[PDB]
Amino acid sequence: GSAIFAPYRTIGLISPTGVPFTSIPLGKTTFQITTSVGRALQTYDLKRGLNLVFVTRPQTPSDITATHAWKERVYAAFGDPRNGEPQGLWVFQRGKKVAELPLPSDLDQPIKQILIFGGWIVACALTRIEVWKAATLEHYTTIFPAASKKGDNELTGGAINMPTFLNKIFVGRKDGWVEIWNVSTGKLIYTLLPPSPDCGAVTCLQPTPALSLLAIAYSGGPLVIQNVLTDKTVLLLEAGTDDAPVTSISFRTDGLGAGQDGRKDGVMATATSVSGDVTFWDLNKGGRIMGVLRSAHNPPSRHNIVRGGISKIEFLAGQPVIVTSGLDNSLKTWIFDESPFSPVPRILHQRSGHAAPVRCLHFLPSDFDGAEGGNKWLLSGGKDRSLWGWSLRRDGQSAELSQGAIRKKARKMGLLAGTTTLEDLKAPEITCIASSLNRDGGMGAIPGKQMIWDKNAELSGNTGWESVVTAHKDDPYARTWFWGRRRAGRWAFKTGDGEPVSTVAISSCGTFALVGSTGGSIDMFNLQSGRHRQRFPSRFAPGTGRHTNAVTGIVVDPLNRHVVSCSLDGKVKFWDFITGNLVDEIDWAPMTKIIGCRYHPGNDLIAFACDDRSIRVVDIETKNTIREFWGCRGDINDFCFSPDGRWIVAASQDSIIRVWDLPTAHLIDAFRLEQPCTALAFSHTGEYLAGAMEGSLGVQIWTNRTLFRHVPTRQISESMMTLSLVPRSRWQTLLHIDIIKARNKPKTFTSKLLVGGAKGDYTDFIEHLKALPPAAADLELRDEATNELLHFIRALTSRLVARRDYELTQAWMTVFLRLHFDLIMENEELLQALGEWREHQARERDRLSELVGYCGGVVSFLRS
Amino acid sequence: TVQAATKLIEQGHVRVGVEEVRDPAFLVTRNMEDFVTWTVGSKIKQNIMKYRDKLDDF
Amino acid sequence: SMIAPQEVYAPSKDTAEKGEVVTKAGIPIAKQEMSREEKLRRRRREKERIRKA
Amino acid sequence: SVQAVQVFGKKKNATAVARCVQGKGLIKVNGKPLKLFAPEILRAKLYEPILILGTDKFADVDIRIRVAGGGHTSQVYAVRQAIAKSIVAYYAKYVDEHSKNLLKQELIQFDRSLLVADPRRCEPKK
Amino acid sequence: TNFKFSNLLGTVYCRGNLLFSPDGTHLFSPVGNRVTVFNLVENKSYTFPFAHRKNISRIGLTPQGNLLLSIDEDGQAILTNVPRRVVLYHFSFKSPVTALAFSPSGRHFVVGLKRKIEVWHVPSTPDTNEDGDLEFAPFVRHHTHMQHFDDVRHLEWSSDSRFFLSASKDLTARIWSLDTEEGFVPTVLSGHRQGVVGAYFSKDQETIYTVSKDGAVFEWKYWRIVNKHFFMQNAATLRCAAYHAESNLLVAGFSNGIFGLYEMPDFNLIHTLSISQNEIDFVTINKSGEWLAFGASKLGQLLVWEWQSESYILKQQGHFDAMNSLVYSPDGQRIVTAADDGKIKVWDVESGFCIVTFTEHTSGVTACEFAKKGSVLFTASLDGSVRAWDLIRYRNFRTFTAPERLSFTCMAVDPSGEVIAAGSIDSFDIHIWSVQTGQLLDRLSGHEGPVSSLAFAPDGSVLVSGSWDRTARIWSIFSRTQTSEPLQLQSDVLDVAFRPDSKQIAISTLDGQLTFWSVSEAQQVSGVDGRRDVSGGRRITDRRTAANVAGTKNFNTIRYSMDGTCLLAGGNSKYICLYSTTTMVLLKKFTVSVNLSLSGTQEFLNSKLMTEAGPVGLLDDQGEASDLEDRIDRSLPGSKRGDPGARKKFPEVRVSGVAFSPTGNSFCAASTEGLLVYSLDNTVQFDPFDLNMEITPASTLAVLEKEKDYLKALVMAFRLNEAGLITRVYQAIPYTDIGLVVEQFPTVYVPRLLRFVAAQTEQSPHMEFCLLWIRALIDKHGPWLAANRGKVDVELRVVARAVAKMRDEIRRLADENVYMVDYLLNQ
RNA sequence: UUGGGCUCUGUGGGUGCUUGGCCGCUGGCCAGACCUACUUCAAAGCCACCGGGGGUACCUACCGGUUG
């Protein structure tokens, strides 16, 4: 795998898959909603918003194909054996795995229906049903349906349980048949035949709130709702289109809702995989229709990139509220109010993400120091033409930056009930985004309501203005944004040439936006007033410095001295900020086409993505190309400085992410994913990358191992008189342990100097006195060559010639001369050692005193 | 009145000395009864200079 | 928090029990050494201090 | 709902008001235009904020100055102080805050008496 | 230029449990936001990188002392890596955490919530697993049980980590497992009188000790009680107790500042003494059993106590009131700070302790300053007095005061410290004393308001007064004409700071605007309007919004840096504001506090707080307290500046004074929640100087080992600016070739080299090597340094710092040794 | 752009880092179940916020008692 980075969580993502959610009731006060990430699950509360409770770990090997949240455990099934990947049925609790489940050896089919009832866990793959006993997680049997024409054995309605029907399971085939199976003993006990034999594939089936009745739901259109022990039809409806049958069907168990005022039960809900519109049925007399939520979720649009559709309807049981989950990465929930009687609800909650891949990423800069700053706010501009400000610290505090009352214009136009559609009613898709908040004043920036994208200044200059300037796909307008207000800003800017915007920058003083056309010119728009202030050039040559083709990168020196521009057609160009004239250019004309640009302030480093698949790094004041990194086989999709200024991380077109060191100037790491990564962004701590991969509608976050452990790799792959080391607070306490003891009051080991004097090596003893605590060192330091004093003076003389601890030599010697002066003043066996010690002490002392007298007196002179 | 002055010093228009006082129980001593006036960007003070027809937006 | 030398010992009249006298230089100079002129000058100096104080 | 700024200026006794509003370039001093007030030899001192700041800063505003008191010289200093404070104040409240700071830098790098009037007290020497 | 966060300093302790390392030599002390460790056997402190949202409630540690779990109030959890000081996991218990005990086997930890007892598996870390990273939700939970009745004050494990035991707040203790034993039923330790503050095991796990709040300590056997025994105490209740089971001893700290110390197989008093006048909050006890640690939460009052050699190894305290000033010694190694507590105390930058506390003022100390010399600490206070402290003898020369009684709020001493200026609010003249005489030299005129910032020039020719007559003033004293020169300003002058070359001065004025003035020809050169740059918005008791409060939109204090390029500026707000002088641009801005038991932190304070009475953090809940001195509100109505009463819930966020370090790369904020040092971080961020394509560490070491050209390798390694490479080539070239390199070395890398060899002199064990470097550099580069002398004035003074902490630290010892041995050899 | 604008009101999310609803909680329940047991040993003391001056008959507190 990878060397530096490691998968943490894929963020920006609630419900992509056609694997439906699962509801469970917690107690009497919350329900819990479990969706599939892909190769993870997530649970959400109801009452606490749709806030995230868990996200399932470990990431399962394949993608998840089924789910069911029984009593406290969340069961998951994953893997398509027909195409490669391993299958499995893992069993989770509290977000972590607590069991597996033994699949049969004879199994080759992806597994679609997990269903727990009785004492049984029952899963339905594609043409067989494997049933485990749930009290011991132990495999019981495998039910094989009959076959007539090699299509009738297929099991597409799923399987289901009735409440009061004992050990039985009801399956819906690709023929019209629904079969009744005693799953405890395996036998096909009864089979029931469709009404209207022209309509003959069971697409969806559901129990009723009445006993012994089902809503079985055929591909030709009819909903049939039946007794299943009289085998007699109770109602027949024509709900599906032949081009668009019912795929979701869900009764309400509230006990009211029907009868044109709302006092009787019998409210049905249905939806279809072909449309994002849910249809409600009064069920009493003959079951009239009563209304339809049109574009509850997005429609599956031919020749559009968004991924609408629906996946599941569920009435939250016993309650007036109904969760529906689309395929457009959105789970929403709707409420039948009772004060008027609307047969079409309003939203109570909604959570959603990108219904399309993510095209640009940006981590928002530091809330100036700390206070949830540096890293928490991602900012993704996707291909569903909308920003999102994602949050790392909690997923429930994430939302779109709004471009207006767009669903008001979409329902107010005919554009929601089936010119353009809703994503086409938003802005274009976003090429790049540039932010600098020091003029983001919080929630209240301009505290009224302002016109969006217009094409005051006392209240601006006291409270804030727009944060994020943004360049879009094919428009000449750099549109601006308020970060703290989560809102489209009151400005949009043209370029000067009229050609669409190529690259947009904002100065880090937060006042100037600075836009760059694909035709060459550069404009500068003050964000407070929203006014054109400087053109590059103004009106070397003073007026002539103009670019040719698209300015693919521009960034400002953060002291507002120079702005550096960077076109594709040739060269990089050095502009004066306060004048607009042109100072110096670095010229790479006959070779290069710089497609992208990054900047590190405080390091003054600008990294260029030359179209030779290279990254040429230049220092903005040195103006010499400090490096280049040749490592890419596809073109550079994205590239980004690490916040330290050490690393460059480039996601290439060949689906390899690489990372080069800047001091070492070598590839530290390089690794290969499953998909080409389109977008990259670091944090401003070093803790996270994010990457948007071509195909998934979320980004994924990589933690950084070079913080949390020592990853040591540097592999260029392809595929005199010295002191001691003892603290001054260890020997100066030896010097002054007369008074440190006094202000602190309220109101073989002795043979080491002997053996070390037997040998001519005292370094074991010196290796003790360098390592004893100072009370024990003043304690332990406190005839005929078995004395300790001559061994000590000889030891410090040996250390004075060996030159290894000078401060400890003078330290031990001065405490020795203070507390052993009597026996050495009277005794005579050691005054040779004080003579020789005095001589060598006079040598090293006189030399060192000449040194520091010159240094102290002449440095302390040169200061005057 | 004391109700109007109390409301003004809980909305924070006053200062005693250099600090914007927002406590209605702030005991004022005899020489600090000279260094008490309106705070810097005060709408009340613009109403006073505006009444007196001598304001200045500078 | 220790003490200055001029607060440990400073030479003065209370510190000298002499026929000499500790001067303002800090140095004891004895009267028996002192001639007519120097005892005369110390009389006129101390009387200068009386006419000031 | 108009873009109006009132501004004063001072000297010894000459006080001058100037109202600066959203206009089209004119400066009128006591009804008569600015190039007609203050007898000829001091109109350069009238013009000093204009040809520091550039007329392009002034082509969107109207400055109306009333001057009272003082002699001729003190009325000139009161006028030019009212001009400079008028445009700094209008750019304070209506156009962006950066341009105010740039105008204050130009006027202060020339002479601070265009913005802050320093009246003379006396010196009772010690 | 690029300042990150160095140590918090100036508070040893705040609310919270404190802990030892298992080595016994590190003390883990919670300050408000953060945790400071200080290395105690070799005194050197450090604060962690993280910062909680509220005050620290608790800290736990792994037995292998590598993993630290801190808790802020309402259960806001962290766990960080102490050997590599990085922050690792975030977590949130949902209740507030009132007990926390990490397992002795490093495997589980029990947390005691407000009644809940949840035992959790400790997360495996990337230091533990082989090829492993951060997981997502790493904390898994082993059990939870809520079969208690009230709060759970304490949690104590076994020694073998199979039982743990809970000290209630109701009345009882409870003994509990981790897995089901076969002869064990989980059971309840019966009635005390008030409620148990501890319940500790022995080594032999038969008798269980339990320590209540009303003094009583019981011994239980198998399950009845073998002997209950109280002890007397007059007017106090038992509020903490720690029990070392290996050495069989129980400490017990009380409400009246006293702790008792009892050897307990049988009840037997070792010792007892009193350390505070206020209650003892937290007791921890060393793994050895030899050091006891006591935290008294009302004042600062952290102390460590050797229980057999009865002695304070530590007794430290912060400020219990707001600070008012800090400065640095001209060495740069100690910062002094004064407060409204009355004390002026002297803090060491390293080691994180106060080296002196001067208590000879009363009633709040306003100002604080040094001379050029760094010997004398001139300070000023509302007592009415300027005390001139002798800092080598730790006692004051001379306390000056005014003839009529004043209360001085501002203070400035001449650089050749023989002239004192002070200034007050009561009078509005400015008083000048003479140090080498002792009298009052003058009082000076001119101002129509209380002079509110005084500053002498670092030349010492010009005094500058800034007063509430919206004016400043050049006071030219020292010549024969004691003349003035006023500076008519726009608003009330808040501050005055000098350029370290005396040619330019900056004033803060009450608009929020800074302006810059020539001093020789008095004339404004520049100015910032910083009103929007400083707005740390919406304290509580603001019914106005965050960006409309005038009162957080002005700078109290400004300084220049030692180069003379950037200014610090700061006010009654949350942002410290770092400007420049030549281009006037805001360079950098720092959020002081992330805290939320402070007040002025969140601009846009959220509406979940505002109940139908008002802010929920404004309801006086002091009657919700079980202790009498907690319940009694002995405050005075309407007191802003220092009162003994001090309800003091949610203090605001000010900076009370910033100052630059005299050596480079550091930064001080005297804020409310401590004394923050910011430092120019240099060990992570790559930053070259003028670098080419070839220049790698393989190229520097290539011309170091293959073809040894020491000048090209030295300028090469400078030219990368990497400390490992400049250390490698520095300790690679020889002391014969030093004079060759410096004799032919480029002139424009010289002060970088002077700062480097100054740091290597003060830190590396290479005396004669580095002193040969300094000798060669000043010998060759003499006329350059003397000619410039202001461009290099910080580089010459970090060197003079190094060659005088060498001249005084070891040559007193060399002289005393050579003349001592000369005597003993003379006999 | 096949209507627009002000104002007011409501609901949901957000305005601090994401570990479940409830209980008699190492277990159980979310459709509840069982309901009334079991018992050898009352308690250790101290402390505990009324504004200033003043009165003291009766009550109360405390101190010293007095018989019966």
PDB file of N, CA and C in Angstrom, chain E residues 165-188:
ATOM      1  N   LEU E 165     -12.675   0.005  42.346  1.00  0.00           N
ATOM      2  CA  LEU E 165     -13.532   0.348  43.459  1.00  0.00           C
ATOM      3  C   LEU E 165     -13.822   1.842  43.434  1.00  0.00           C
ATOM      4  N   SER E 166     -15.067   2.184  43.777  1.00  0.00           N
ATOM      5  CA  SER E 166     -15.636   3.502  43.528  1.00  0.00           C
ATOM      6  C   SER E 166     -16.023   4.196  44.818  1.00  0.00           C
ATOM      7  N   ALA E 167     -15.477   5.389  45.010  1.00  0.00           N
ATOM      8  CA  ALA E 167     -15.805   6.249  46.130  1.00  0.00           C
ATOM      9  C   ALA E 167     -16.893   7.210  45.695  1.00  0.00           C
ATOM     10  N   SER E 168     -18.027   7.129  46.380  1.00  0.00           N
ATOM     11  CA  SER E 168     -19.268   7.800  46.040  1.00  0.00           C
ATOM     12  C   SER E 168     -19.219   9.306  46.266  1.00  0.00           C
ATOM     13  N   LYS E 169     -20.381   9.924  46.064  1.00  0.00           N
ATOM     14  CA  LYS E 169     -20.783  11.186  46.659  1.00  0.00           C
ATOM     15  C   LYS E 169     -22.061  11.003  47.459  1.00  0.00           C
ATOM     16  N   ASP E 170     -22.666   9.819  47.397  1.00  0.00           N
ATOM     17  CA  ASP E 170     -23.872   9.591  48.170  1.00  0.00           C
ATOM     18  C   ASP E 170     -23.494   9.335  49.618  1.00  0.00           C
ATOM     19  N   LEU E 171     -23.116   8.095  49.935  1.00  0.00           N
ATOM     20  CA  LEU E 171     -22.389   7.769  51.158  1.00  0.00           C
ATOM     21  C   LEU E 171     -21.391   6.632  50.998  1.00  0.00           C
ATOM     22  N   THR E 172     -21.453   5.846  49.931  1.00  0.00           N
ATOM     23  CA  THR E 172     -20.921   4.492  49.926  1.00  0.00           C
ATOM     24  C   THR E 172     -19.766   4.336  48.945  1.00  0.00           C
ATOM     25  N   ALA E 173     -19.064   3.217  49.082  1.00  0.00           N
ATOM     26  CA  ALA E 173     -18.089   2.795  48.089  1.00  0.00           C
ATOM     27  C   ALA E 173     -18.589   1.500  47.474  1.00  0.00           C
ATOM     28  N   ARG E 174     -18.118   1.144  46.279  1.00  0.00           N
ATOM     29  CA  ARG E 174     -18.544  -0.131  45.702  1.00  0.00           C
ATOM     30  C   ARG E 174     -17.387  -0.856  45.035  1.00  0.00           C
ATOM     31  N   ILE E 175     -17.307  -2.168  45.285  1.00  0.00           N
ATOM     32  CA  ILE E 175     -16.270  -3.048  44.749  1.00  0.00           C
ATOM     33  C   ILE E 175     -16.823  -3.842  43.573  1.00  0.00           C
ATOM     34  N   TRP E 176     -16.075  -3.787  42.458  1.00  0.00           N
ATOM     35  CA  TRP E 176     -16.499  -4.167  41.116  1.00  0.00           C
ATOM     36  C   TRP E 176     -15.380  -4.876  40.364  1.00  0.00           C
ATOM     37  N   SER E 177     -15.776  -5.734  39.426  1.00  0.00           N
ATOM     38  CA  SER E 177     -14.903  -6.574  38.610  1.00  0.00           C
ATOM     39  C   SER E 177     -14.606  -5.928  37.269  1.00  0.00           C
ATOM     40  N   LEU E 178     -13.996  -6.724  36.390  1.00  0.00           N
ATOM     41  CA  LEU E 178     -13.988  -6.490  34.952  1.00  0.00           C
ATOM     42  C   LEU E 178     -14.662  -7.604  34.177  1.00  0.00           C
ATOM     43  N   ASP E 179     -14.607  -8.821  34.699  1.00  0.00           N
ATOM     44  CA  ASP E 179     -15.264  -9.996  34.158  1.00  0.00           C
ATOM     45  C   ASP E 179     -15.811 -10.774  35.341  1.00  0.00           C
ATOM     46  N   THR E 180     -16.756 -11.673  35.084  1.00  0.00           N
ATOM     47  CA  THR E 180     -17.443 -12.364  36.173  1.00  0.00           C
ATOM     48  C   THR E 180     -16.520 -13.365  36.855  1.00  0.00           C
ATOM     49  N   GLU E 181     -16.276 -13.155  38.141  1.00  0.00           N
ATOM     50  CA  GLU E 181     -15.564 -14.106  38.975  1.00  0.00           C
ATOM     51  C   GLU E 181     -16.563 -15.123  39.507  1.00  0.00           C
ATOM     52  N   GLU E 182     -16.058 -16.210  40.088  1.00  0.00           N
ATOM     53  CA  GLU E 182     -16.967 -17.293  40.441  1.00  0.00           C
ATOM     54  C   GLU E 182     -17.450 -17.235  41.885  1.00  0.00           C
ATOM     55  N   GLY E 183     -16.734 -16.553  42.773  1.00  0.00           N
ATOM     56  CA  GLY E 183     -17.174 -16.454  44.151  1.00  0.00           C
ATOM     57  C   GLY E 183     -17.443 -15.027  44.568  1.00  0.00           C
ATOM     58  N   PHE E 184     -17.466 -14.126  43.591  1.00  0.00           N
ATOM     59  CA  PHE E 184     -17.583 -12.696  43.818  1.00  0.00           C
ATOM     60  C   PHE E 184     -18.954 -12.208  43.379  1.00  0.00           C
ATOM     61  N   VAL E 185     -19.623 -11.479  44.266  1.00  0.00           N
ATOM     62  CA  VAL E 185     -20.802 -10.691  43.915  1.00  0.00           C
ATOM     63  C   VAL E 185     -20.461  -9.227  44.177  1.00  0.00           C
ATOM     64  N   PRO E 186     -20.813  -8.312  43.272  1.00  0.00           N
ATOM     65  CA  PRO E 186     -20.315  -6.930  43.354  1.00  0.00           C
ATOM     66  C   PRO E 186     -21.049  -6.203  44.462  1.00  0.00           C
ATOM     67  N   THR E 187     -20.314  -5.560  45.367  1.00  0.00           N
ATOM     68  CA  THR E 187     -21.005  -5.240  46.612  1.00  0.00           C
ATOM     69  C   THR E 187     -20.609  -3.870  47.137  1.00  0.00           C
ATOM     70  N   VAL E 188     -21.328  -3.454  48.175  1.00  0.00           N
ATOM     71  CA  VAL E 188     -21.425  -2.060  48.570  1.00  0.00           C
ATOM     72  C   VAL E 188     -20.862  -1.894  49.977  1.00  0.00           C
TER      73      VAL E 188
END
